[PDB]
Amino acid sequence: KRFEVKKWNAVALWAWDIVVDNCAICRNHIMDLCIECQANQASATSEECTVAWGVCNHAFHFHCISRWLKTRQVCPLDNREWEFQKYGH
Amino acid sequence: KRFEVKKWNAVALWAWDIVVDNCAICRNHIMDLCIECQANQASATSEECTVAWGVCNHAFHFHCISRWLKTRQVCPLDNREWEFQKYGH
Amino acid sequence: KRFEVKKWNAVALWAWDIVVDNCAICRNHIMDLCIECQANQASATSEECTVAWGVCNHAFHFHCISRWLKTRQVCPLDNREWEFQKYGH
Amino acid sequence: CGCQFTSKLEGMFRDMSISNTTMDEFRQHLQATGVSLGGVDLTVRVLTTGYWPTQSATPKCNIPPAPRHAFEIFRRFYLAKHSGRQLTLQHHMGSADLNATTRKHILQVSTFQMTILMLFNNREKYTFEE
Amino acid sequence: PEYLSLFIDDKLKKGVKGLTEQEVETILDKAMVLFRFMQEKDVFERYYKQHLARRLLTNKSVSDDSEKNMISKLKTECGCQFTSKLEGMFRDMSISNTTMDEFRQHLQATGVSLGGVDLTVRVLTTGYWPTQSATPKCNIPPAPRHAFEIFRRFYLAKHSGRQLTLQHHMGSADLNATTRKHILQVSTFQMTILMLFNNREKYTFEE
Amino acid sequence: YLAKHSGRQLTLQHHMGSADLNATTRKHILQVSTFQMTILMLFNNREKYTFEE
Ligand SMILES: [Zn+2]
Ligand SMILES: [Zn+2]
Ligand SMILES: [Zn+2]
Ligand SMILES: [Zn+2]
Ligand SMILES: [Zn+2]
Ligand SMILES: [Zn+2]
Ligand SMILES: [Zn+2]
Ligand SMILES: [Zn+2]
Ligand SMILES: [Zn+2]
């Protein structure tokens, strides 16, 4: 051949157990509202309900994980302490 | 085809760090005497020096590992306590 | 053929991450002075700044690695402790 | 007996336990990736040399195309799983289920007739020399 | 703050600017003093993190020591709000190089395809690095594609607990061309077009 | 090495090592210390050479 690839320096991304099909807290979906929002428009003003990402790469609704901060907050999908590393999918 | 294999029930064997090329204690070989035997015939009467196998699947000469039992015996290739599970290669 | 090679007993040399194009400490080059020498003649008296080689086969300027011996000296390109095995390229 | 050889007996029982855990481990490994298609149904086992008397684990023989790719997949996946295990190939242990085909009756080979039957599948009318 | 971040990136990547570490410490102190009388720290931190991503996902060996000085100055200036996440993505880069060593050991044990030779693959987390746009779904050149397959398989068999995603907007490669054999460089953007050219030349935009 | 130990790069040299050249009335094996291998290979490719060749 005329051009042959010798080295490749790709970067791989990964997530723990985000479950796109279902919030592990609310069991609706990774998107499309939560159990305590229901109607998408209602009185939301651009739907403040977003997706919360922690240092443990686990994804839930920001509303879903905000209700669990009051009591024990141990990211119930693992033993890591839940943080807030990214907002929005 | 006339005959197609559906299931296979093989058994896999494995060893930790036996190093066939060298006793990790004596650095001569897994076989062929040790540092304190040297000549194969000498006065050995069928060469009592054999290969000692432990529960940690590590292999040395029986003479090699017998000298280490006096002091700390922690199978210096790992943290497991050395045992005597098999004699002879 | 009349002469055919049967055995070959070559010896292979290798280096870890010397980076000929750049000192990993100073980022100028493997040769051609360092950050704290600049002018080649100045007042150098044959340019005492040479290339230092360690047991970890990593190459920097002798001046580059001498400034790192004061603090932690762990050969920051790996975990091996830096030594002085060769002077001069 | 006491505590002379009973401990090693329960140790090889624990080896069987480790073997079955490794079974489902490789099952999930093939379910996720498993490039080798010959891994339709794998029932591989993992044992230690010290416990079981498998010192004669060096019959060096060929392996049939589909289960041979099964063994390739096994080796690769298991080595990624735990770099540090000298995977040695052997034939004097285990079994298999050969699906033959008027109905489809499944035979059984104890890893001794697999190579001969695979050679017959590749080409019939063989003999001792072949 | 964006221009300040660009200036600090230029001073931290280009070693020519500020040779001896003496004038480097003074210039860093002056830069942090100037940043002291500055508001809107959020955009400054965001752009500094973006510059970190740019400088750590490219050719390394930029300083391998000044990073400690930068994080120490950030600790004494910002505090413990975003510096912890900075050192966390640094630990991610350590995790990246450890997983690169893991893939090298996997190619050493197996390496079915020749595409998996010196695979400089890297592993990062979604939360730390701003890689939320990790879904360019594009074809991969045969050998690199097989290499990626092998790497995925190995990593999974190892910690089975991560959903590896494919992307193209990051990394680089070294294309060995061939009168001498000069090796080119593609930043994972021209690999597909060049592979298509290798498969068949005389292509256009439609192809 | 590129596939396995990719943490280093090798360099080629000739001033070290040896070799066993199988010549061929019997088949006597010669010995070259990686210095005469190139000249003998050129002779094998084409005999009747000189210093210029
Ligand atoms: Zn939810
Ligand atoms: Zn909500
Ligand atoms: Zn978590
Ligand atoms: Zn020994
Ligand atoms: Zn002995
Ligand atoms: Zn051991
Ligand atoms: Zn330097
Ligand atoms: Zn100097
Ligand atoms: Zn080093």
From Swiss-Prot, chains A, B, C:
Keyword entries, A-Z: Acetylation, Cytoplasm, DNA damage, DNA repair, Host-virus interaction, Metal-binding, Nucleus, Phosphoprotein, Transferase, Ubl conjugation pathway, Zinc, Zinc-finger
Keyword Repeat recorded: no
Catalytic activity annotation: S-ubiquitinyl-[E2 ubiquitin-conjugating enzyme]-L-cysteine + [acceptor protein]-L-lysine = [E2 ubiquitin-conjugating enzyme]-L-cysteine + N(6)-ubiquitinyl-[acceptor protein]-L-lysine; S-[NEDD8-protein]-yl-[E2 NEDD8-conjugating enzyme]-L-cysteine + [cullin]-L-lysine = [E2 NEDD8-conjugating enzyme]-L-cysteine + N(6)-[NEDD8-protein]-yl-[cullin]-L-lysine
Sites where the protein binds Zn(2+) 3: C56, H58, C75, D78
Binding-site list for Zn(2+) 1: C23, C26, H61, C64
Compartments where located: Cytoplasm; Nucleus
Effect of C37A: Strong reduction in ligase activity
Gene Ontology CC terms, in alphabetical order: Cul2-RING ubiquitin ligase complex; Cul3-RING ubiquitin ligase complex; Cul4-RING E3 ubiquitin ligase complex; Cul4A-RING E3 ubiquitin ligase complex; Cul4B-RING E3 ubiquitin ligase complex; Cul5-RING ubiquitin ligase complex; Cul7-RING ubiquitin ligase complex; cullin-RING ubiquitin ligase complex
Domain of life: Eukaryota
GO annotation terms (biological process): cellular response to amino acid stimulus; cellular response to chemical stress; cellular response to oxidative stress; cellular response to UV; DNA damage response; MAPK cascade; negative regulation of canonical Wnt signaling pathway; negative regulation of insulin receptor signaling pathway
Molecular functions (GO terms): cullin family protein binding; molecular adaptor activity; NEDD8 ligase activity; NEDD8 transferase activity; protein-containing complex binding; RNA polymerase II-specific DNA-binding transcription factor binding; ubiquitin protein ligase activity; ubiquitin protein ligase binding
Broad class of enzyme this protein falls into: transferase
Enzyme nomenclature, EC number: 2.3.2.27, 2.3.2.32
Domain remarks in the Swiss-Prot or TrEMBL record: The RING-type zinc finger domain is essential for ubiquitin ligase activity. It coordinates an additional third zinc ion.
Family assignment from sequence similarity: Belongs to the RING-box family.
Subunit structure: Component of multiple Cul1-RING E3 ubiquitin-protein ligase complexes commonly known as SCF (SKP1-CUL1-F-box) complexes, consisting of CUL1, SKP1, RBX1 and a variable F-box domain-containing protein. Part of a SCF(SKP2) complex consisting of CUL1, RBX1, SKP1 and SKP2. Part of a SCF(FBXO3) complex consisting of CUL1, FBXO3, RBX1 and SKP1; this complex interacts with PML via FBXO3. Component of the SCF(Cyclin F) complex consisting of CUL1, RBX1, SKP1 and CCNF. Identified in a SCF E3 ubiquitin ligase complex together with HINT1 and CDC34.
Name the UniProt record assigns to this protein: E3 ubiquitin-protein ligase RBX1
Source organism (scientific name): Homo sapiens (Human)
Organismal lineage: Eukaryota, Metazoa, Chordata, Craniata, Vertebrata
Full-protein interval shown: 20 to 108 of 108
Swiss-Prot record, chain E:
Tissue: Brain, spermatozoa, and testis (at protein level). Widely expressed.
Post-translational modification: Neddylated. Attachment of NEDD8 is required for the E3 ubiquitin-protein ligase activity of the BCR complex. Deneddylated via its interaction with the COP9 signalosome (CSN) complex.
Cell compartment(s), UniProt: Nucleus; Golgi apparatus; Cell projection, Cilium, Flagellum; Cytoplasm, Cytoskeleton, Spindle
Subunit details: Forms neddylation-dependent homodimers. Component of multiple BCR (BTB-CUL3-RBX1) E3 ubiquitin-protein ligase complexes formed of CUL3, RBX1 and a variable BTB domain-containing protein acting as both, adapter to cullin and substrate recognition subunit. The BCR complex may be active as a heterodimeric complex, in which NEDD8, covalently attached to one CUL3 molecule, binds to the C-terminus of a second CUL3 molecule. Interacts with RBX1, RNF7, CYCE and TIP120A/CAND1. Part of the BCR(SPOP) containing SPOP, and of BCR containing homodimeric SPOPL or the heterodimer formed by SPOP and SPOPL.
Biological function: Core component of multiple cullin-RING-based BCR (BTB-CUL3-RBX1) E3 ubiquitin-protein ligase complexes which mediate the ubiquitination and subsequent proteasomal degradation of target proteins. BCR complexes and ARIH1 collaborate in tandem to mediate ubiquitination of target proteins. As a scaffold protein may contribute to catalysis through positioning of the substrate and the ubiquitin-conjugating enzyme.
Note: High-glucose conditions in renal tubular epithelial cells lead to up-regulation of CUL3 expression, significant increase in CUL3-mediated ubiquitination of MRPL12 and dysregulation of mitochondrial biosynthesis.
Family per record: Belongs to the cullin family.
Disorder named in the UniProt entry: Pseudohypoaldosteronism 2E: An autosomal dominant disorder characterized by severe hypertension, hyperkalemia, hyperchloremia, hyperchloremic metabolic acidosis, and correction of physiologic abnormalities by thiazide diuretics. Neurodevelopmental disorder with or without autism or seizures: An autosomal dominant disorder manifesting in infancy and characterized by global developmental delay, variably impaired intellectual development, and speech delay. Some patients have seizures, others have autistic features or behavioral abnormalities. Additional variable features include cardiac defects, failure to thrive, or brain imaging anomalies.
Name of the protein described by the UniProt record: Cullin-3
Organism the protein comes from: Homo sapiens
Covered range of the whole protein: 385 to 615 of 768
